[PDB]
Structures are given as C-alpha cells and as structure tokens.
C-alpha cells in the first residue's frame, strides 16, 4: 500500500513499490530488501507531519550463504567448509544492519516505530552513536521514538540502538561462544543507522542533456546498456546485473559495469539502488556523486572478475566495488553522496600510474561483514570528510604523504585495525586524522599479524625483509573516542622509523577490555636500528588520565611498548 513522502528543499525522502521483508535468502532481482523490524519517518521540527522513509536492510551473505558461484541455490554449502568469510554465529543469533537516508536543509524529527511487535522502550534506554553528538529524544503516545535532527552543514551519521535489542558477543579467544567466555562487544542484534544528509554541492551534480548523458532505465542491466556518454545516470529506481560476460540472460552477480573511456562521471539519484559494480577506463578526471546506492550483495565472496566471478581470491582481479585499471596520471576521483551495501571484497582501487588523488565526502559502506571488506584507498594529498564505515577489515590505510581525513565514524567487526600503515616499509608524511568515532568493534581473537587495535601495522607481507632505517612514518592523529570495551591503542610491528607522530586527545570512556583474550594490551616490539617518535597527550581511560606513572603493561595503558625505545617517546 501508499507511502506519503515529501520532497523539496527543506527535505526530501524516498520510497520503493518493490520492497521485500525477507531475513534468510536473496530478494527478487527487481526488490531491495526492506526492515523486517523498523518504520522510519521524518517531519519539520515540532511539526507533527511525519512522511515515510525506506529503510533498508543488509545481512550476512546476503542470503547466499556459503556459496562458491553466484548461480549456486542459496544456502547450499558449496563453499569448500575451510574456508573461513569472516561470519560464523552472527546469521543465528540475527545479526543484520539496516539504515534510512534523507536529505535535509532545516531541522527535523526522525520518528522510528517497530513493526514486528517489539517495544522499543522508553526514550531512556535509547543510545545513539557517536556518543560525541547528543540528541534531544522523546516517546509519542504510540510508543514511537522521535529525535530531533538539527540543520548541519556537514549532516549527521549516527546509529539508534535499543537496550532490549542488544545482544552480548562472547569470546573463548579462539571463535565466539553462546555462554562463557569474555565480553569482546555490545551491539544491536537489529541494527538501525540515520544518514541525515545535506543537499549535494552544486557543482557535484553533474549538467545533463541527452547529448551527454545515457539515462538508464530501471530493470535488468544487460551487457552495454551503460553505453558510452560522458555521464551515466540513475533515476529513481531498482536496477541489477542480469548478464554473464558472454551475454547469457538471468544470471546475478555474474559481470560488473565495465564503462567505456568516454564516460568520466556516474550520478545515483536518491531512490537509486543498484545490484553491480563500476569500473572507470577514462584518463580524465572521474566522479561518483548522488544520493543512491549501490550495492554488492548479488556478488558470492571474493567475487573474481578474471575467472567467472567465483568465490577464488585473486589481489589483482577479485571485484572492487569502485575500480580502475588504466590511469593516465594527474587525475582525481570526486565521490561526494554515494553508500555501497555489501561488498564481496575490497572497495576501492585505482591502478596504472602513480598521479591519483581522492575527495571523498558524505560518503557511506554498509553490510560490510565478509572479510577483506577494507575502506577505500587514501591516495596521495587526498581530502576524505564526513563518512561512516561499517568494516571488517581496515578500515583507513595510510600508505601515502599528505592526506587528510575528518570527521570519520568506523563500525568494525573482528579484522585489522582502524588505522593500518603496515605490510611493507613505507615514506610517509603530512598526513592528519581528526575526529575519529570507533563506536564498535567485536574482536575474537587478540592479533598482531592482523593487528586487533586503533592505530595498528601489520608485519611484511613476505619473508627475507628488512626494516628500513632510511624511511619513516610521520602524522598527526587528534580527538579520537573508542565506544565500548575496546581493543588496544596501538599495534605496530615497525618496518621503519616513527618520526614525530602525533597522538592527541585520545578517550576510552568504556575501558579497554582487561580480559584473557589480551586484546586490551598494546604491542609494540623490539626492532634493532628503528626509532619509535610517538607524542601521546590526553589520554583518558575510564574518565582517568594514562599518564607516565600508569601506562604499563599491568596498569591503565597496558602499554607494552619494549624498553629499548626508552626516551624517544612520551605521554603527557
């Protein structure tokens, strides 16, 4: 039946006429998957107006199961039983992540009802996160809860958990438990995250005519349709890749959208949601922009786009979500608006020559819980704003000089670290990190290769490596919250130098974990020839300053960084 959306310039929201309440397989290729549990709505502040929001939903394998090819019946187990995605107990105890998303120029209300018989409780037991950003919640007459979303700029990204809803990951630090253990996180068994977005910058939308632009029409994607005009666009609609590479109709997950070196821009309408991928030919600059989706869950594990698109991990041929093998050299990609859902692999990459840089803002991932499912590349002098990134792998790789990344809010699952600069030895600086929200992390195991920590760098790659003492790691990292019982705040296996590498007000309002898992404890071991420059001021742990009288070990810090870099790094 009806929904009653609005849409002009105070606010808009969307809807779709082809949703699907459905918690175990895939949807029908031409439905997007719809909350099971939550209604969304929004009106002018204090007005009492409330129009219909979609809210979508993601969960773990997409429905697909453990499947080696993406024509394989859902949940048949063809996926060889070693290997290992990333998920386990998390589809039997529920676990999924929905979201809604409007755009906004005045403050609102946001009303969230449950439809599937739940009480969601009294405004009281409600948390949003970013704990940084407060909200003013109350309860209608029918049970509703209403927050008030004031006008910003920059918007707001936040998570609405309910204190009935959640549930307690346990570890025996081998695999989760459903009894005993130790407590590794707190999450909702039924996610709910608000993108409240601004309208997009004027010059982000591109100018079309039908001389520049191929408008797609909603329905399956066959090979070419994209065509070959300087912009693709999506309108409204539900959109998925229907083709195999020889042209074979009705099969999903099995091609990607490979855009002739014409077409420099994709614009994804709000209300767009499409099942495929997207790699760029073009020389020029490139753009993502628009308020759409596009999403991966069609797309078995490890997707290969070299070998049919079967679960085989190939580093350079698996599918990224955003791609590019042919770069000409002094181009940057401008992605301003778009979410990806579900992606089977890494998100983001651009290769074939070195002069590439990135401005990345209000930009979302999400159902991000297959391994490998890292953030995008941070390439050099790039400028990353305003985003929220549900990860299970690392989450921002600073691997090159000169980038800049604010207002950042990370959701991870059980892999890397947060901030990653390991696996070989690296020339870095000019880099900055400011206001960086952990609002969860669920990690199993306590790790080092893999490292389970904030700022964290894994160990060479491949054997017969030496650490460099010519090169060094220089960056400044400022105002930092870790939600929860949190993992450590350092792991680094050095490969290099560490030279004036700022850490600066840094809270764990919830405590490390202090379990037997040992994932609260930093790590920093002995490498012969290496300095290790770190000036960390402003630490706080439970409310109570990390300062040099506790930072050890079997103290506050738990800072178990080796005796030999004594005096080349501070804590003040």
């Known amino acids: 039946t009806t929904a009653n959306t609005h849409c002009g310039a105070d606010f808009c929201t969307w809807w779709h006429d082809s949703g699907e309440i459905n918690t175990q397989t895939p949807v029908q290729p031409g439905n997007v998957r719809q909350s099971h549990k939550y209604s969304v709505q929004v009106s002018l502040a204090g007005t009492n107006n409330f129009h219909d929001s979609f809210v979508y939903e993601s969960i773990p394998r997409n ?18 039983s070693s290997v290992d995605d990333g998920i386990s107990i998390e589809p039997s105890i529920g676990l999924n992540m929905a979201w809604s998303q409007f755009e906004y120029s005045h403050d609102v209300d946001v009303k969230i009802l449950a439809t ?5 409780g009294s405004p009281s037991d409600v948390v949003i996160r970013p704990v940084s950003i407060s909200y003013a919640i109350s309860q209608s007459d029918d049970g509703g809860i209403v927050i008030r979303v004031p006008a910003d700029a920059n918007g707001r990204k936040f998570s609405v958990e309910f204190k009935t809803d959640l549930y307690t990951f346990l570890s025996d630090g081998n695999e989760y438990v459903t009894s005993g253990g130790s ?11 608000i993108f409240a977005s601004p309208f997009l910058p004027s010059g982000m939308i591109p100018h079309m ?48 959208i490979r855009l002739n070196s014409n ?40 997707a290969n786009a070299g070998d049919n698109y079967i679960a085989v991990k190939s580093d350079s041929t698996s599918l990224r979500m955003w791609w590019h093998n042919n770069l000409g ?21 651009f290769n074939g020559n070195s002069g590439i840089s990135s401005q990345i803002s209000d930009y979302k991932q999400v159902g991000a819980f297959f391994f490998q499912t890292d953030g995008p590349e941070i390439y050099p002098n790039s400028v990353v704003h305003d985003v929220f990134w549900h990860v299970n792998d690392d989450a921002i790789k600073i691997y090159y000089s000169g980038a800049s990344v604010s207002r950042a809010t990370i959701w991870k699952c059980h892999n890397d670290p947060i901030i990653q600069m390991g696996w070989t030895s690296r020339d870095i600086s000019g880099v900055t990190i400011d206001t960086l929200n952990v609002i969860h992390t669920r990690y199993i195991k306590s790790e080092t290769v893999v490292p389970s920590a904030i700022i964290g760098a894994s160990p060479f790659y491949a054997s017969g490596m030496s650490p460099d003492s010519r090169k060094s790691i220089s960056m400044t990292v400022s105002n930092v919250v870790c939600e929860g019982l949190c993992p450590s705040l350092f792991r680094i296996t050095p490969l290099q130098n560490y030279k004036n590498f700022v850490v600066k007000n840094v809270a764990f309002p919830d405590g490390l974990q202090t379990n037997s898992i040992g994932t609260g ?8 020839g290496l300095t290790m420059g770190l000036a960390i001021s402003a630490w706080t742990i439970g409310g109570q300053k990390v300062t040099m009288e506790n930072f050890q070990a079997n103290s506050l810090g738990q800072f178990n960084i080796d005796g030999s870099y004594w005096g080349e790094w501070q804590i003040s």
């Open 63 to 80: 429905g697909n199961g453990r499947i080696y090819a993406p024509t394989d019946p859902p949940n048949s187990n063809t996926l060889d």
């Open 116 to 120: 599937d018989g739940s009480s969601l």
């Open 183 to 193: 407590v590794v996180g707190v999450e909702p068994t039924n996610a709910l995250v």
């Open 209 to 256: 005519t039908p001389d520049n632009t191929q408008t797609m029409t909603p329905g399956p994607i066959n090979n070419g349709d994209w065509g070959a005009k300087s912009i693709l666009y999506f309108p409204p609609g539900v959109y998925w890749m229907n083709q195999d590479q020889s042209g074979n109709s009705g099969k999903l997950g099995s091609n990607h």
């Open 263 to 302: 077409t420099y821009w994709v614009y994804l309408a709000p209300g767009a949601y499409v099942k495929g991928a997207i790699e760029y030919f073009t020389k020029q600059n490139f753009y993502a922009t628009g308020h759409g989706i596009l999403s991966g869950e069609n797309y078995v594990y490890q």
């Open 329 to 349: 050299g002094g181009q940057t990609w401008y992605c301003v608006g778009p979410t990806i859902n579900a992606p089977p692999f890494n998100t983001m990459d």
């Open 521 to 528: 404890e930093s790590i920093i071991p002995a490498a012969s």
